Amino acid sequence: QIVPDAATCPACLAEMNTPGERRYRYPFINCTHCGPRFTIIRAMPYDRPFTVMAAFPLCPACDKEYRDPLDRRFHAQPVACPECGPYLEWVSHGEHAEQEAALQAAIAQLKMGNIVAIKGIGGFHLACDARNSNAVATLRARKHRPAKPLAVMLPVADGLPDAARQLLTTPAAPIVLVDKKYVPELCDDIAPGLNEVGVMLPANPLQHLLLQELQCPLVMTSGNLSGKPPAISNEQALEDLQGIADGFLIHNRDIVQRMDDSVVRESGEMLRRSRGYVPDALALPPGFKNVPPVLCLGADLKNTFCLVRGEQVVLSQHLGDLSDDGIQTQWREALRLMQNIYNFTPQYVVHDAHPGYVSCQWASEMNLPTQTVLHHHAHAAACLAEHQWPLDGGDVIALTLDGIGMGENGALWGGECLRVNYRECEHLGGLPAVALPGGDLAAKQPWRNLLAQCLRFVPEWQNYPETASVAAANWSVLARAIERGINAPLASSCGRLFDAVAAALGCAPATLSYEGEAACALEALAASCDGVTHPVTMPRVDNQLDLATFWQQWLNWQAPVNQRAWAFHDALAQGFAALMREQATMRGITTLVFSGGVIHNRLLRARLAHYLADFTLLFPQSLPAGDGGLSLGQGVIAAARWLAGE
Numbered sequence: 277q278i279v280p281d282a283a284t285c286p287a288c289l290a291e292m293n294t295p296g297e298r299r300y301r302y303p304f305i306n307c308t309h310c311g312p313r314f315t316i317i318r319a320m321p322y323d324r325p326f327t328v329m330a331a332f333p334l335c336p337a338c339d340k341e342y343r344d345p346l347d348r349r350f351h352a353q354p355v356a357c358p359e360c361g362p363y364l365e366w367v368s369h370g371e372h373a374e375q376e377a378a379l380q381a382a383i384a385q386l387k388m389g390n391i392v393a394i395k396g397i398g399g400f401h402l403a404c405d406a407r408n409s410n411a412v413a414t415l416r417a418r419k420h421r422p423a424k425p426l427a428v429m430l431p432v433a434d435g436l437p438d439a440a441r442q443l444l445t446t447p448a449a450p451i452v453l454v455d456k457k458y459v460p461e462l463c464d465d466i467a468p469g470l471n472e473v474g475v476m477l478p479a480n481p482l483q484h485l486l487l488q489e490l491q492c493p494l495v496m497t498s499g500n501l502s503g504k505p506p507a508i509s510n511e512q513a514l515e516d517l518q519g520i521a522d523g524f525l526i527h528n529r530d531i532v533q534r535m536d537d538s539v540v541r542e543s544g545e546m547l548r549r550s551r552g553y554v555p556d557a558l559a560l561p562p563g564f565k566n567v568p569p570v571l572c573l574g575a576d577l578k579n580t581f582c583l584v585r586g587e588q589v590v591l592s593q594h595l596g597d598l599s600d601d602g603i604q605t606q607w608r609e610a611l612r613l614m615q616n617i618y619n620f621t622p623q624y625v626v627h628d629a630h631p632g633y634v635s636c637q638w639a640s641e642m643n644l645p646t647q648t649v650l651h652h653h654a655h656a657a658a659c660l661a662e663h664q665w666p667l668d669g670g671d672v673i674a675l676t677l678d679g680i681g682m683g684e685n686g687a688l689w690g691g692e693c694l695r696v697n698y699r700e701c702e703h704l705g706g707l708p709a710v711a712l713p714g715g716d717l718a719a720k721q722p723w724r725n726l727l728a729q730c731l732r733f734v735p736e737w738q739n740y741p742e743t744a745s746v747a748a749a750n751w752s753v754l755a756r757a758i759e760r761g762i763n764a765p766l767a768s769s770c771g772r773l774f775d776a777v778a779a780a781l782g783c784a785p786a787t788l789s790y791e792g793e794a795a796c797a798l799e800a801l802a803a804s805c806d807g808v809t810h811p812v813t814m815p816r817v818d819n820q821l822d823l824a825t826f827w828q829q830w831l832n833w834q835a836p837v838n839q840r841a842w843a844f845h846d847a848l849a850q851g852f853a854a855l856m857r858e859q860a861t862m863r864g865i866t867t868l869v870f871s872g873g874v875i876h877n878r879l880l881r882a883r884l885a886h887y888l889a890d891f892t893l894l895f896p897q898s899l900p901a902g903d904g905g906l907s908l909g910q911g912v913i914a915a916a917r918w919l920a921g922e
């Protein structure tokens with residue numbers, strides 16, 4: 277079996293740390309229970325000849341160990357030592373070093389407050405002292421990343437909650453999101469405006485060596501140029517990262533698969549499923565058997581593909597935004613190795629119903645019969661599947677909350693109540709559809725959504741303090757284009773509604789630097805409120821939420837900003853709850869499903885569960901609520917359609 281790449285084991289950590297051992301401070305030590313797996317396989321099977329480690333024939337000393345049955349290194353494919361293995365290299369503006377000398381140069385740079393690019397398991401990282409405000413601001417400036425939170429590597433898990441330390445110390449060694457109150461050493465530029473910080477432990481030997489030496493928290497963010505995939509070769513690192521890093525700690529062991537760090541919450545919730553989980557297969561739900569090989573292309577953002585066959589499914593690693601420059605290459609190498617590993621040959625392809633998608637283009641190039649699944653249908657089905665809902669389980673009411681996904685008849689959805697099973701998706705109601713002014717700009721400039729909401733629902737909106745920056749502009753040009761439907765399509769988007777409220781509270785920059793920035797900011801503000809008595813509501817009118825009443829109560833309910841943000845979450849949860857209750861109860865349905873990237877909001881989840889405690893509630897947990905889980909939803913719907921003989 278090939279298993280995920282795994283965190284350095286305590287045995288290897290002790291060997292690396294003991295003077296006189298052959299692998300004393302060898303940054304490439306591993307054995308049978310730890311080290312890189314998926315990321316070092318060129319083709320099958322898992323044997324030195326077909327890994328990256330065929331380029332390093334074992335010296336006589338390591339040869340003895342490979343043979344020995346009692347040795348912890350019986351058939352450790354990588355193995356090797358400082359005599360025959362890869363070795364570290366350092367490169368920096370007319371400096372070069374190697375081995376221990378290279379390590380020590382990197383350490384000194386990090387101590388000086390500089391930024392170093394470090395070769396990891398599934399790509400490169402950019403690192404600096406997370407306590408040093410100038411270094412972090414310098415890293416942000418050079419990377420053009422003014423706000424998106426930075427991951428941080430801690431030398432030990434001391435002082436973190438039990439749940440976080442448990443998760444951090446697993447062989448997967450994910451980044452775990454933790455209240456930043458627990459980590460006061462970090463500067464404010466790590467996760468500015470947010471309540472959580474993603475922390476991680478050293479999980480390869482080079483990281484261990486570094487942290488033992490530095491004894492402090494280090495930024496440890498992806499070594500990518502913005503709008504580009506992480507570099508996996510030395511050459512690409514050195515080219516992409518030359519204007520960002522002050523030095524490079526690299527090495528001559530190739531990486532053959534891109535494999536980002538995984539991200540989970542301390543709660544257990546999966547956010548990004550990569551290193552340490554891939555390529556583990558998942559069992560399909562009861563009733564799903566003898567399924568033909570289907571390739572599911574997933575979503576254009578936060579992409580994963582899925583391979584469905586027999587009674588199992590295997591997701592790819594996080595591949596990111598499919599319009600990034602060079603991502604198709606990484607996607608295709610992932611699919612090549614994944615097909616090799618599972619001896620998998622697709623007979624069918626499933627992709628999203630949106631004809632504008634990149635993924636949809638790639639499907640047409642395949643020469644297999646193709647089929648289409650509605651975005652939000654796939655979100656709901658991926659949740660049902662994670663909960664092992666049987667093939668013949670019966671209908672649920674689903675709430676699918678995200679930015680924008682294409683719905684029935686070309687509509688733009690993102691705030692929908694649906695009747696769902698594995699074959700059918702009936703649209704029942706949800707948020708009203710409201711223009712996206714300036715098209716793609718509406719996701720980058722929250723105020724555009726406040727304007728759209730105000731022109732639809734808010735009499736005399738120019739008189740409220742919270743619309744002041746919009747009201748003072750020449751907004752009528754844009755209002756005229758909205759009215760005429762010029763690059764102003766309607767979308768029933770939960771994401772855009774959060775953006776309109778964050779624009780009204782001033783809690784995000786006027787123009788965002790990352791997708792969902794304003795929504796995260798608004799959730800972070802709300803989360804600082806313990807709960808408040810307030811009069812804001814979102815009443816049901818027929819099958820839609822009455823936003824005119826929401827806005828009038830919300831704009832006129834003065835309160836500390838954190839209470840205003842909490843009241844929005846509570847009112848939204850209560851309005852969708854009333855909708856889903858009406859719809860489920862009058863259909864004899866007892867189970868509700870929640871999915872879509874907005875369902876990553878923990879406060880909304882808490883409020884929905886509070887209001888809907890009279891139902892069985894299904895929320896995502898081990899796959900992401902967002903687009904990273906979409907390929908699995910497409911897979912089970914394709915499977916169910918086939919199993920029904922359609």
Ligand SMILES: Nc1ncnc2c1ncn2[C@@H]1O[C@H](COP(=O)(O)O)[C@@H](O)[C@H]1O
Pocket residue numbers: 577578677678679680770771772774791792795796799872873874875876877878901902903904
């Ligand atoms: N904490 C949050 N609260 C509300 N909305 C969010 C949150 N995080 C992400 N979103 C929205 O959901 C979208 C991602 O959904 P998806 O495309 O399903 O992965 C983002 O672009 C945001 O518009």
Ligand SMILES: [Mg+2]
Pocket residue numbers: 434435436457458459460
């Ligand atoms: Mg602490």
Ligand SMILES: [Zn+2]
Pocket residue numbers: 284285286287288289306307308309310311
């Ligand atoms: Zn080991």
Ligand SMILES: [Zn+2]
Pocket residue numbers: 334335337338356357358359360361
């Ligand atoms: Zn050796």
Ligand SMILES: [Zn+2]
Pocket residue numbers: 651655678679680681872873902903
């Ligand atoms: Zn989505």
